[PDB]
Design a protein around this motif. Structure first.
Motif, PDB file in Angstrom:
ATOM      1  N   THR A 186       0.830  -1.198   0.000  1.00 52.42           N
ATOM      2  CA  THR A 186       0.000   0.000   0.000  1.00 52.42           C
ATOM      3  C   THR A 186       0.868   1.254   0.000  1.00 52.42           C
ATOM      4  O   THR A 186       0.598   2.222   0.710  1.00 52.42           O
ATOM      5  CB  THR A 186      -0.958   0.006   1.190  1.00 52.42           C
ATOM      6  OG1 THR A 186      -0.242  -0.319   2.386  1.00 52.42           O
ATOM      7  CG2 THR A 186      -2.071  -1.003   0.986  1.00 52.42           C
ATOM      8  N   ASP A 191       0.648   7.841  -1.384  1.00 53.19           N
ATOM      9  CA  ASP A 191      -0.155   7.410  -0.251  1.00 53.19           C
ATOM     10  C   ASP A 191       0.641   6.456   0.620  1.00 53.19           C
ATOM     11  O   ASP A 191       1.247   5.507   0.117  1.00 53.19           O
ATOM     12  CB  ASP A 191      -1.445   6.732  -0.705  1.00 53.19           C
ATOM     13  CG  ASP A 191      -2.391   6.457   0.448  1.00 53.19           C
ATOM     14  OD1 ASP A 191      -2.033   6.763   1.606  1.00 53.19           O
ATOM     15  OD2 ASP A 191      -3.499   5.939   0.198  1.00 53.19           O
ATOM     16  N   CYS A 237      -1.843   3.229   0.274  1.00 56.05           N
ATOM     17  CA  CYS A 237      -2.382   3.269  -1.082  1.00 56.05           C
ATOM     18  C   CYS A 237      -3.705   2.536  -1.200  1.00 56.05           C
ATOM     19  O   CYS A 237      -3.922   1.509  -0.552  1.00 56.05           O
ATOM     20  CB  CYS A 237      -1.387   2.655  -2.067  1.00 56.05           C
ATOM     21  SG  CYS A 237      -1.990   2.598  -3.771  1.00 56.05           S
ATOM     22  N   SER A 238      -4.589   3.096  -2.030  1.00 54.61           N
ATOM     23  CA  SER A 238      -5.914   2.542  -2.269  1.00 54.61           C
ATOM     24  C   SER A 238      -5.802   1.036  -2.425  1.00 54.61           C
ATOM     25  O   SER A 238      -5.117   0.540  -3.322  1.00 54.61           O
ATOM     26  CB  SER A 238      -6.556   3.180  -3.504  1.00 54.61           C
ATOM     27  OG  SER A 238      -5.842   2.854  -4.684  1.00 54.61           O
ATOM     28  N   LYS A 239      -6.465   0.314  -1.531  1.00 55.62           N
ATOM     29  CA  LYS A 239      -6.138  -1.074  -1.260  1.00 55.62           C
ATOM     30  C   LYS A 239      -6.367  -1.891  -2.525  1.00 55.62           C
ATOM     31  O   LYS A 239      -7.397  -1.744  -3.190  1.00 55.62           O
ATOM     32  CB  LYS A 239      -6.966  -1.546  -0.070  1.00 55.62           C
ATOM     33  CG  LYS A 239      -6.697  -0.648   1.140  1.00 55.62           C
ATOM     34  CD  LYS A 239      -7.076  -1.228   2.481  1.00 55.62           C
ATOM     35  CE  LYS A 239      -6.162  -2.361   2.858  1.00 55.62           C
ATOM     36  NZ  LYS A 239      -5.953  -2.424   4.328  1.00 55.62           N
ATOM     37  N   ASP A 247      -7.132   0.374 -12.023  1.00 54.21           N
ATOM     38  CA  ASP A 247      -8.350   0.547 -11.248  1.00 54.21           C
ATOM     39  C   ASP A 247      -9.578   0.594 -12.145  1.00 54.21           C
ATOM     40  O   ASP A 247     -10.547  -0.144 -11.937  1.00 54.21           O
ATOM     41  CB  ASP A 247      -8.256   1.827 -10.422  1.00 54.21           C
ATOM     42  CG  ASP A 247      -9.426   2.000  -9.487  1.00 54.21           C
ATOM     43  OD1 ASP A 247      -9.481   1.287  -8.466  1.00 54.21           O
ATOM     44  OD2 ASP A 247     -10.293   2.849  -9.776  1.00 54.21           O
ATOM     45  N   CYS A 261     -10.096  14.148  -0.530  1.00 58.85           N
ATOM     46  CA  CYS A 261      -9.525  13.214  -1.489  1.00 58.85           C
ATOM     47  C   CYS A 261      -8.899  14.006  -2.622  1.00 58.85           C
ATOM     48  O   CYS A 261      -9.267  15.155  -2.877  1.00 58.85           O
ATOM     49  CB  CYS A 261     -10.567  12.243  -2.042  1.00 58.85           C
ATOM     50  SG  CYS A 261      -9.886  11.112  -3.267  1.00 58.85           S
TER      51      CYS A 261
END
Lengths: 196, 208, 220, 200, 213, 200, 206, 196, 200, 208
Positions: C18, C28, C31-33, C53, D117
């Motif tokens: 991550t 991050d 990081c966005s999992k 993604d 975000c």
């Protein structure tokens, strides 16, 4: 991008130059005297990428006045022209430029007035009149139009004035001032700066 | 050259003193260093109302101005009256605005005496369309501008205007290595342009 | 980024980090999992993270609707082919990297999708930046038919080696176990790094900064 | 190129956001009142940084699309919904990439829950609990936050910390700076303050 | 273009106090996307009152950190005196210049004490321009570090607060905090933190650990 | 990347290594370099993975409808032609490794072959990929006429082993396929089993 | 434009000395050309040398080293070039010819056991030098170096047997997943006894 | 290149432009207007690559006139500003040469004068004062130093004259004449050009 | 250019093709690539003939001087060392690969294979030139121990011919030399004597 | 920055009214988007006879003026008369010309009061050694030209000149992003020069 001009008469040579030194959108100096007193009777008109102009002019002035000092008399104008041509041609290889466009003007006691031309490739050629820089294109036509093998000094001056005001009228650059000097048997005479 | 250079422009001329416009141009296709021809007429008789000019590229100038001639005759039919100079300049500029940046090298001047009187516009490859009192384009255009600027006068008499055009064209071709040939003079008088003469530089040199 | 997966006795145990790295700067810390789409077909990816993604979302959608039409659970090979052909024609374009794993009627499966569309059925693959170290760990310690906890451990050190021996990778270790019956949210499985205690006690003082204009907008 | 920076940090039911005011053509400031933060809702803002053309393009297009969404659903948009929304808009123009890195700060229309975000320039959200930055001076700005942050910040301290962070950072970037605007979104009211920044 | 001369990262940080001089750096040697090792200090001791830090192309780091010592030794043999801080600074500026047209891809920081024992930090650029500074962070994470130091020490954007002179304890705490924070966002930094302190009682050096990733 | 196939009487024998490289790193060391296009028609994609895999699969797609339509076993020459034009059309962007080998009811066993770019040869044996350059001499000196299936297998194994030793971009294990009247005999010679022609 | 390269060299410190290894392989690109050349060499009774990258440059290194070593033995004072000195000397050579843009297309590993202390040194293309308990070059750094650091993290000091086993296991992995790797490799070892390069050993199929 | 400048007073906007076009070195028209009449109270200043400027400007001309005649009322300067910004930004991705840097000035009965800076990137920006072209570099400082948010037309004209005189003093190009117009409650007003 | 040399018991056996290219043209078809370096030392050139044969002449000059001063026929390892340095790119514009092999009283036949760039490694047999790639596998398959002069010659000719067929840079006739203690035996293989092989 | 992180300076200025010349320059050093320092002394103090500026390359200018200081002090020790401003300028010009086009980024400009008066010469990398009266160099020097031209007057007064220089450089840095920090000012009177003041830009903004 600068401007030189020379005119040969019966017994005199009238030459003129701009007085603008710019490195960018901005001009840094409005009195740039770019005419080098070779001797008591010879002037050197130097233009080209700056920095080398001053150095080459100083080298020539150095060595010519050195000749005069070692030899009593002083160089004939043809000698100076050929000397500068040889220096520039020989050095054209090693120091990749000197990149200077020249007009050597002078008058001697018995061979009369003379005016020699040089591009940065060191091509010597005598001529009754010539010029340099982007402005020369707008001017050589006028010089052809109103020149004769014989011209009075005042008529040459007014012709030069015509040429310069044409430049200001049509050329895109700004040249609000123009040095001008004349050569004859009585040394070298400063003349009225042409201003607007 | 793989067949496409066609010109780079040689020594046009046009101004609009108070007796209509006169135009002048030489005739020397400069295929690189070798002359293609000495007798290339560069003033283009678009119609008995309006004159073009070839400069910068031979084929492009000729083709696009001929197309302009088609278009303007169509206009004169549909509207039943002659097209104005400004309108013709607009048409040419719009036509040449497309094909921007594709190698076009036009340098035409549209000249005519329409209802607004004298008409003179500079139309080129990259889209400039400006009127004015004095013009010349081509390699020798600089020398032409010199002599012209020192000769021009809106009140100048007609014959002296002819002399001015001849002198300017001759000096420009005398300095330029790329301009040459026989000089052409066209006067656009009151309705209907009038051909003046086609004299030779060699004879001009004797006359000068 | 360093992602790896194996096929143990009764499923797949995906692994991922991550650490999002925008350039040489940590994007991050968490990081966005990297786990993804609808059940029993979880995949993880790397490369141009955005396209990984959004490709996963696209295929997830297109396959979920397919399954709903079928009334039967989807198959790994189905997603495999879809990812083939989409990561294809946009060849010479961005594409992405993917590790696709799942356990359908045919048991576990594991393919390794590549940008141009290179795929292959393997017992173990590693992708990302530290894929080299992860593959080293696997080839050192992989034996066929590992147990669930054994596979989880194996992936734990596989990801850890990439974490401690790469520049673009390292954060919370993420595990993704999919079996014929079960499924785990090991988010995250184990974290080796803890932020050092802040010895400073700055406690930003009020009135620290001059203010030119103070405009207030009551809403409620 | 044009330069600039944006930032937002969360807090105790309060989110902060800030961006500079310099608009300069790659060496030379044009004016000091350029708009980079834009209101997307009662308690939802977006801050842009990048090419000014793409800033003023994405902002207007988002206004368009979000207004359409609001009229369609009849309800104020969720922050996560807007996040996914903008996550798409950059992506359709994939091979035309809009040179900008948006950030989002907002609260729950049902709970006022803190939320921020960011996005990559083609859309890859970093849903972060603490802070995001974007623009040219990203690294300095990361550096400032990484120390200056603290958990559970009451709004006044949040404002002071964001002020200090951005003023320390943009001061160290040549192309960005020259004025800093700050917005504080709390459960009820909005405060927008301007800061005494080195105007050099 | 990009040279054949690899970048080795690292981060250098130095604050000059009233009688001390902090020199500290990360000890991780890296190239591309792989770490070479974890115990490469980037701070080297020159005199009992001067300590150098160097970072950049690690080969040039070595060559410089071991060419300077030769200059010190020969200057001692020629002058019977250990050159002062300013001497080191001028020397480094010239020697860096000497390779003008093929420069040492290095960032260098000098920490030490002056004649009066006041803190002194000299910061350099690869060619050789240098200027006396109270503090500077140099290297990969220099962007992440230096502004925070500017706020904390130079009191920029600090209003209505006394300028408390930097004590040794506060300086040490600040350096440890800033480096542990930099380890978060810069990848090149990690695996340790070596700190060299220059005092009139000599040089004592401390090391602490960071994120091993 | 040392695909090779040999034709014999009444059947064919194929052979390829198992190593997909990414330059100097092996992505997969057990790659199934043999694609069965149909029940009795194999091939060997080689030159790059995706552009070959996709084309092969598409050829499997085609010729399947085409064999159901004719309601007859697919002719080997038909497969060759189909997977010829499928490459030729995109000969400007695709790489390829077609050495199509298979058996038909009518004309015994065939090995049609062509590198990327498209053309047609029905030769005795086909070699393609990296190690073919190295194995030319061995194969040429060794191949004879009328050799049966077992010595075809041994010959293939020996050739592939030589390629294995000299090539650095091919490796792993030697996959083999013996297509004949009854069916395919896919076997995997590895380790000690592969020919050991020692260096001295 | 390196003509012919070697793949990698592995070496890890251990209690009693340093053990390093490499494989016989001469690659002219993807072509595996030479399959018996030694890429490791015994510097003296206390020091070895491992070599990757170009081979001809390695032969030239052997030339100069085997001349300087003998030059030292002839003096017969008792002093010997310690491994630390050899590493330091390699760095300066790497500069002396990189500074003038004519480098040595190599990655050099020094392993020595002087005065009861082990010592391992890395040298590369550009004269990047350092000391580390375990070293790996080329794809070795990406593959075996991770395993070596992984194991060395938990256990600080290794005996000869276990370190050697580590070596052959990492070499097996490298042969598995590296394109420019050969099935057969030497292993070298230094103790107080002396440098004892041994075996045309191979990764026996497992 | 060329040079444009805008100054906004408390209740008016003042614009000024140079009046020379170039080909290489020559200034074919010395009496060239680079400034177009959008509608009754909106003036547009254009500059950039030859050809594109006039085409885009007159495209906007026809659009705004068509708007006025379709609606009867008048388009607000802010609205036309945003409209031009959109019509320029969209063409950025499908027209490689489309260089037009703009200063859209005008007056609105509601919000007073409004001057808009417009880089060819179509990045619209309000400004109390702005300028394009190279001479903007030399002049924006002078325009800054002697500016106040409130300036009667007289001081505005004098500041503009100071600006132009500074150009003629320093700038390397030749810009002898400038056209000046002012927009206020009573339409646009032509002001005598600045000759030298 | 397919030079390849093999050591036998009691000496070495050289061998080389006879073809010189200047593009798709055969500059010479009787090129004698074997060069007499000494009374019992030859060499084989490969590629860029000029930058080779100049090295050949220089090295044979130095060997002659060395031989007349030491007063004993030179060791093969000696001549192995005067290529290694000046082929270690003391010129570095010497694209050249030379396999030198001869015989000495001290260690009998020896074969060295100084490649492109400057290495110097002894081998039982060596291959050089462009066509080498097409026969590496064959020679690795066929070479063994304890071969005699006759079978070594047949081996050499077979390998050279196998290279001859495939590579476009191999044409004309086959040249051979049999170095031994007794003397030298040059022979040229032409026409029918080249070993043929049944075409597909 | 594989091997290039040269520090540099910008927005220097000077003018030479009756009471002698004034040097005023900023002190912002940028390395791309990153200002490396804040108070870099962009006024090189060669000796208490001459002063110098720095722009384009901080290291280059720094060393070259350093070496000229060496040469100047040597000239003093030999001749035991102070060197002339013209002599110093020409010496630097010769010293910099060799190394022509080698990447030198010098943009300096020498000032001082020598025995023939107060002088001011511009010396750049490419050999421009031009005299003058009102000079300014750097990226943000155009604004300095503007304001200084509007403020310059050979009969200007001491505090008037101080405010002129301060305000001019303030406008310049306010418009140039690459120019900022605190401004340093130097006054060159009759032989032996003084330092007027060096204040921060933010203070200047509050002043205005």
């Amino acid at each position: 991008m600068e401007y030189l001009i020379g005119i040969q008469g019966p017994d005199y040579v009238l030459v003129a130059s701009d007085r603008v030194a710019a490195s960018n959108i901005v001009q840094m100096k409005d009195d740039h005297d770019k005419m080098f007193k070779m001797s008591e009777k010879i002037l050197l008109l130097c233009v080209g990428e700056a920095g080398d102009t001053v150095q080459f002019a100083e080298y020539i002035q150095k060595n010519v006045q050195l000749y005069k000092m070692r030899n009593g008399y002083e160089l004939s104008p043809t000698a100076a022209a050929n000397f500068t041509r040889r220096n520039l041609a020989d050095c054209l290889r090693s120091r990749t430029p000197y990149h200077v466009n020249l007009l050597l003007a002078g008058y001697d006691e018995h061979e009369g007035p003379a005016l020699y031309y040089m591009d940065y490739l060191a091509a010597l050629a005598k001529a009754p009149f010539a010029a340099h820089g982007y402005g020369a294109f707008l001017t050589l036509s006028i010089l052809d139009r109103y020149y004769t093998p014989t011209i009075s000094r005042e008529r040459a001056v007014e012709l030069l004035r015509k040429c310069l005001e044409e430049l200001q009228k049509r050329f895109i650059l700004n040249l609000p001032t123009f040095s001008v000097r004349i050569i004859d048997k009585n040394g070298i005479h400063d003349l009225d700066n042409i201003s607007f | 050259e793989p067949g496409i250079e066609m010109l780079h422009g040689t020594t046009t001329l046009a101004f609009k003193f108070r007796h209509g416009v006169i135009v002048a141009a030489d005739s020397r296709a400069t295929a690189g260093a070798y002359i293609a021809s000495q007798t290339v007429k560069k003033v283009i008789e678009i119609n008995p109302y309006l004159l073009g000019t070839m400069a910068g590229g031979a084929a492009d100038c000729s083709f696009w101005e001929r197309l302009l001639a088609r278009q303007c005759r169509i206009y004169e039919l549909r509207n039943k009256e002659r097209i104005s100079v400004a309108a013709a300049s607009k048409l040419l500029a719009n036509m040449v605005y497309q094909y921007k940046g594709m190698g076009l090298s036009m340098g035409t001047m549209i000249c005519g005496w329409d209802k607004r009187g004298p008409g003179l516009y500079y139309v080129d490859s990259e889209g400039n369309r400006i009127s004015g009192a004095t013009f010349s384009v081509g390699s020798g255009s600089v020398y032409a501008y010199g002599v012209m600027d020192r000769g021009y006068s809106y009140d100048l008499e007609v014959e002296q205007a002819y002399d001015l055009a001849r002198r300017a064209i001759y000096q420009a071709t005398y300095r330029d290595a790329y301009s040459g040939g026989a000089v052409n003079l066209y006067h656009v008088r009151e309705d209907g342009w009038i051909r003046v003469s086609s004299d030779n530089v060699a004879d001009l040199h004797e006359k000068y | 980024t360093t992602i790896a997966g194996v096929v143990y006795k009764d499923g797949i145990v995906l692994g991922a980090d991550t650490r999002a790295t925008e350039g040489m700067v940590v994007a991050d810390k968490n990081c966005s999992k990297i786990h993804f789409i609808s059940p029993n077909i979880y995949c993880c990816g790397a490369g141009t993270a955005a396209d990984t993604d959004m490709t996963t979302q696209l295929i997830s959608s297109n396959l979920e609707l397919h399954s709903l039409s079928t009334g039967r659970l989807p198959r790994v090979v189905t997603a495999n082919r879809m990812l083939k052909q989409m990561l294809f024609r946009y060849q010479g374009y961005i594409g992405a990297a993917l590790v696709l794993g799942g356990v359908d009627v045919t048991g576990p499966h594991l393919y390794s999708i590549y940008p141009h569309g290179s795929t292959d059925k393997l017992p173990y693959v590693t992708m990302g930046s530290g894929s080299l170290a992860a593959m080293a760990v696997f080839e050192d310690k992989f034996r066929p038919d590992m147990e669930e906890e054994e596979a989880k451990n194996l992936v734990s050190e596989a990801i850890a080696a990439g974490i401690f021996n790469d520049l673009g990778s390292g954060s919370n270790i993420d595990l993704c176990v999919i079996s014929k019956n079960k499924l785990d949210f090991l988010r995250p499985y184990t974290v080796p790094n803890k932020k050092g205690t802040r010895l400073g006690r700055y406690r930003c003082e009020k009135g620290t900064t001059a203010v030119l204009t103070e405009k207030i907008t009551p809403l409620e | 190129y044009n330069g600039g920076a944006v930032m937002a940090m969360k807090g105790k039911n309060c989110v902060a956001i800030a961006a500079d005011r310099r608009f300069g053509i790659q060496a030379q400031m044009v004016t000091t009142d350029f708009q980079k933060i834009f209101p997307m809702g009662d308690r939802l803002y977006i801050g842009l940084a990048g090419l000014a053309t793409d800033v003023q393009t994405v902002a207007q297009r988002l206004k368009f699309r979000l207004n359409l969404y609001e009229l369609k659903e009849g309800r104020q948009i969720k922050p996560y919904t807007l996040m996914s929304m903008v996550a798409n808009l950059l992506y359709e123009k994939r091979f035309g990439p809009y040179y900008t890195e948006p950030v989002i700060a907002g609260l729950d229309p049902k709970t006022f829950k803190p939320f921020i975000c960011s996005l990559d320039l083609i859309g890859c959200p970093m849903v972060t609990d603490d802070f995001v930055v974007s623009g040219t001076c990203a690294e300095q700005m990361y550096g400032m936050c990484e120390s200056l942050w603290e958990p559970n910040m009451d709004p006044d301290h949040l404002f002071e910390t964001i002020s200090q962070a951005m003023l320390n950072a943009v001061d160290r970037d040549a192309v960005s700076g020259m004025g800093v605007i700050v917005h504080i979104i709390e459960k009820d009211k909005i405060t927008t303050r301007t800061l005494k920044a080195r105007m050099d | 273009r990009f040279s054949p001369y690899v970048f080795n990262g690292g981060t250098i940080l130095a604050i000059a106090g009233e009688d001390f001089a902090i020199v500290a750096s990360d000890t991780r040697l890296s190239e591309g996307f792989s770490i070479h090792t974890r115990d490469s200090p980037k701070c080297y001791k020159l005199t009992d009152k001067t300590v150098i830090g160097c970072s950049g192309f690690h080969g040039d780091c070595l060559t410089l950190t071991k060419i300077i010592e030769a200059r010190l030794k020969m200057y001692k043999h020629s002058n019977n005196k250990a050159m002062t801080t300013g001497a080191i600074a001028a020397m480094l500026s010239t020697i860096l210049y000497s390779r003008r047209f093929f420069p040492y891809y290095v960032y260098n920081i000098i920490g030490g004490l002056d004649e009066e024992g006041k803190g002194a930090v000299y910061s350099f650029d690869p060619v050789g321009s240098y200027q006396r500074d109270s503090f500077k962070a140099g290297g990969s994470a220099s962007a992440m570090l230096q502004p925070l130091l500017d706020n904390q020490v130079g009191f920029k954007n600090m209003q209505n607060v006394e300028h408390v002179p930097l004590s040794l304890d506060r300086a040490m705490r600040l350096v440890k905090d800033v480096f542990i924070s930099a380890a978060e966002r810069d990848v090149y930094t990690g695996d340790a933190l070596r700190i060299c302190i220059v005092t009139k009682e000599g040089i004592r050096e401390e090391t602490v650990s960071l994120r091993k990733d | 990347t040392t695909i090779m196939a040999v034709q014999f009487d009444g059947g064919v024998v194929l052979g390829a290594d198992s190593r997909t490289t990414t330059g100097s790193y092996i992505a997969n060391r057990v790659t199934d370099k043999l694609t069965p296009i149909h029940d009795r028609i194999f091939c060997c994609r080689s030159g790059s993975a995706a552009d070959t895999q996709a084309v092969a699969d598409a050829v499997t797609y085609q010729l399947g409808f085409h064999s159901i339509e004719l309601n007859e076993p697919p002719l080997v020459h038909t497969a060759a032609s189909l997977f010829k034009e499928m490459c030729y059309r995109y000969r400007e962007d695709l790489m390829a490794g077609i050495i199509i080998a298979g058996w038909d009811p009518q004309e015994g066993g065939q090995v049609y072959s062509v590198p990327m770019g498209g053309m047609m040869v029905r030769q005795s044996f086909a070699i393609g990929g990296s190690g073919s350059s190295y194995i030319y001499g061995y194969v040429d000196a060794t191949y004879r006429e009328g050799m049966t299936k077992e010595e075809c297998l041994q010959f293939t194994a020996n050739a592939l082993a030589l390629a294995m030793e000299r090539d650095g971009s091919s490796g792993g294990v030697i996959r083999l396929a013996a297509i004949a009247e009854s069916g395919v005999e896919r076997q995997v010679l590895l380790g000690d089993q592969i020919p050991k022609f020692a260096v001295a | 434009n390196p003509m012919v390269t070697g793949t990698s060299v592995l070496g890890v410190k251990f209690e009693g000395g340093v053990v390093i290894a490499a494989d016989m392989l001469g690659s002219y690109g993807s072509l595996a050309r030479f399959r018996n050349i030694s890429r490791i060499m015994r510097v003296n009774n206390s020091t070895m040398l491992g070599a990757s990258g170009d081979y001809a440059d390695f032969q030239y290194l052997k030339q100069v080293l085997g001349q300087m070593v003998i030059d030292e033995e002839l003096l017969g004072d008792g002093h010997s070039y310690s491994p630390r000195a050899i590493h330091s000397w390699l760095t300066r050579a790497m500069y002396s010819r990189r500074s003038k843009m004519n480098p040595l297309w190599n990655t050099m590993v020094i392993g020595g056991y002087a005065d009861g202390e082990s010592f391992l040194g890395y040298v590369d293309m550009l004269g990047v030098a350092y000391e580390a308990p375990s070293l790996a070059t080329g794809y070795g750094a990406y593959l075996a170096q991770p395993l070596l650091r992984e194991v060395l993290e938990k256990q600080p000091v290794l005996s000869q047997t276990e370190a050697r086993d580590l070596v052959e296991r990492c070499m097996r992995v490298l042969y598995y997943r590296d394109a420019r790797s050969y099935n057969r490799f030497q292993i070298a070892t230094v103790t107080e006894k002396g440098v004892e390069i041994e075996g045309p050993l191979s990764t026996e199929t497992n």
